[PDB]
Amino acid sequence: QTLTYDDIVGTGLANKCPTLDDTARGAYPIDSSQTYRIARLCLQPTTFLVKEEPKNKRQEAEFVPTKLVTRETTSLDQIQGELKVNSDGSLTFVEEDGIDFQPVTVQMAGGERIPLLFTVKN
Amino acid sequence: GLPWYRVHTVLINDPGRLIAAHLMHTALVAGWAGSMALYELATFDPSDPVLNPMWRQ
Numbered sequence: 001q002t003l004t005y006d007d008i009v010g011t012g013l014a015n016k017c018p019t020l021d022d023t024a025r026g027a028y029p030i031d032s033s034q035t036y037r038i039a040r041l042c043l044q045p046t047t048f049l050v051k052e053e054p055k056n057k058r059q060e061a062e063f064v065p066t067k068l069v070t071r072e073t074t075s076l077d078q079i080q081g082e083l084k085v086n087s088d089g090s091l092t093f094v095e096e097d098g099i100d101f102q103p104v105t106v107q108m109a110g111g112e113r114i115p116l117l118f119t120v121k122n
Numbered sequence: 123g124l125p126w127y128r129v130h131t132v133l134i135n136d137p138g139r140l141i142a143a144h145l146m147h148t149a150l151v152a153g154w155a156g157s158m159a160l161y162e163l164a165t166f167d168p169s170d171p172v173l174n175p176m177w178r179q
């Protein structure tokens with residue numbers, strides 16, 4: 001039931017983050033003395049919004065929607081790092097390594113391509 | 123023969139060629155409307171409907 005490369009290749013599923021069934025409304029007990037780790041963090045962008053530049057100083061500087069033009073190349077995956085339980089029982093995630101950037105180009109109304117380095121580096 | 127300002131009078135008793143002339147006129151006018159629209163679209167800045175609308179451009 002768990003897919004291989006030959007099932008995945010060319011379908012676009014490789015650009016998706018993995019999901020969880022609706023039943024999984026649980027909780028993960030953080031033992032405050034154990035060391036934890038993120039074995040795989042995946043970020044799959046679904047929406048890119050770009051802020052317009054009103055030549056006025058004022059106006060509503062609203063985020064406008066854009067169309068992706070660089071295809072299913074957008075997800076960050078296989079990101080790892082330590083998850084350090086702090087003094088107060090807050091968890092901090094320190095990114096170490098992975099596929100943590102993707103160049104993305106989106107296009108605005110009118111044809112302006114906007115390139116960005118979509119990243120969670122450090 | 124015909125002076126310059128009467129060359130089109132050869133169509134007066136020729137309905138098929140009158141229709142042809144009228145079709146060529148309609149072709150030119152429709153072509154004008156398309157080419158004009160495309161020149162405007164090439165030139166129009168749509169980014170500011172408030173202080174730069176179409177009537178300023």
Ligand code: CLA
Pocket residue numbers: 124126128129130132133142143144146147150
């Ligand atoms: C809608 C426009 C239109 C139509 C349907 C007709 C139709 C006709 N003309 Mg008329 N004619 C026209 C406009 C038109 N003409 C104009 C503007 C002039 C002045 C130049 C003439 C001068 C004229 C003469 C002297 C004669 C005719 C004649 C005729 C008949 C035969 C075809 C011919 O020889 O034309 C000639 C074709 C032209 C003069 C075409 C004009 C070319 C202009 C420059 C446009 C060229 C297009 C170009 C790609 C755009 C340049 C853009 C620029 C900014 C660089 C036919 C009934 C003949 C006839 O039967 O007489 C008894 C004839 O002897 N016409």
Ligand code: CLA
Pocket residue numbers: 126127128129130131
């Ligand atoms: C629906 C409009 C319409 C139509 C179908 C006609 C049709 C005609 N006219 Mg008439 N006429 C009209 C409006 C019209 N006219 C208007 C508005 C005026 C006042 C300006 C006249 C004044 C007039 C005179 C004084 C005469 C005619 C004549 C004629 C006949 C011959 C035309 C010819 O061979 O010219 C050939 C024309 C050229 C070779 C070049 C003319 C180029 C002009 C001056 C500038 C360029 C025009 C440009 C290319 C297009 C602009 C179109 C514009 C509407 C935006 C033909 C039946 C003649 C006639 O009755 O014959 C017996 C004649 O003597 N017309």
Ligand code: CLA
Pocket residue numbers: 137140141144145148
């Ligand atoms: C009931 C039949 C019928 C219909 C539908 C029409 C319609 C028309 N005639 Mg008229 N006409 C008729 C009977 C008819 N006529 C008869 C019995 C005579 C005596 C022979 C005439 C004599 C006559 C003359 C001398 C002229 C007209 C013109 C026109 C046109 C002016 C509008 C135009 O060009 O729009 C612009 C066009 C469009 C937006 C697209 C056209 C859509 C059409 C219907 C597609 C044509 C496909 C069709 C299979 C081909 C033949 C159609 C024909 C019946 C008109 C219009 C198409 C004028 C013309 O031809 O102008 C260029 C013109 O000069 N008519």
Ligand code: CLA
Pocket residue numbers: 130147150151154
């Ligand atoms: C209601 C709309 C309307 C009407 C009634 C007409 C009527 C006419 N057009 Mg058409 N035209 C129209 C809309 C119209 N046009 C539109 C929207 C376009 C696209 C821009 C055109 C493009 C067009 C072209 C390219 C041509 C015509 C021509 C004609 C004339 C054909 C009959 C003829 O032989 O006249 C004989 C000519 C006259 C009676 C002279 C009419 C003079 C007009 C009214 C304006 C005066 C112009 C002035 C002398 C010079 C102007 C500046 C110059 C630098 C161009 C007739 C007067 C044709 C023509 O004139 O052939 C000789 C022609 O070649 N028209």
Ligand SMILES: CCCCCCCCCCCCCCCC(=O)OC[C@H](COP(=O)(O)OC[C@@H](O)CO)OC(=O)CCCCCCCCCCCCCCC
Pocket residue numbers: 124125126127
């Ligand atoms: C899109 C395409 C656009 C193309 C447009 C083309 C434009 C066509 C150009 C037409 C120009 C026609 C001129 C015809 C000229 C010409 O043929 O004239 C002579 C002509 C007389 O013709 P007749 O009937 O004698 O016939 C002789 C025939 O051979 C004519 O074909 O009369 C008319 O044309 C009447 C208008 C007189 C207009 C001319 C008056 C001269 C006055 C001089 C003014 C200047 C001095 C002023 C100082 C203050």
Ligand SMILES: CC1=C(/C=C/C(C)=C/C=C/C(C)=C/C=C/C=C(C)/C=C/C=C(C)/C=C/C2=C(C)CCCC2(C)C)C(C)(C)CCC1
Pocket residue numbers: 150151152153154157
């Ligand atoms: C063939 C063919 C085709 C194509 C088409 C085309 C491409 C067309 C175009 C056309 C066009 C694109 C046209 C245009 C036109 C224009 C015109 C027609 C104009 C005129 C003008 C005038 C007339 C002006 C004058 C004046 C001046 C200059 C100054 C002031 C005064 C006045 C206004 C008078 C197709 C593929 C579809 C299909 C079938 C075949």
Ligand SMILES: CC1=C(/C=C/C(C)=C/C=C/C(C)=C/C=C/C=C(C)/C=C/C=C(C)/C=C/C2=C(C)CCCC2(C)C)C(C)(C)CCC1
Pocket residue numbers: 154157158159161
């Ligand atoms: C079937 C066939 C064919 C066909 C042909 C055809 C049908 C063509 C026609 C053609 C044509 C039909 C052409 C036309 C031309 C046109 C022109 C040349 C125009 C011009 C215009 C102008 C000049 C413009 C201007 C303007 C305006 C008007 C407004 C806005 C501004 C502007 C400036 C843009 C062939 C041989 C291919 C091949 C074989 C078969």
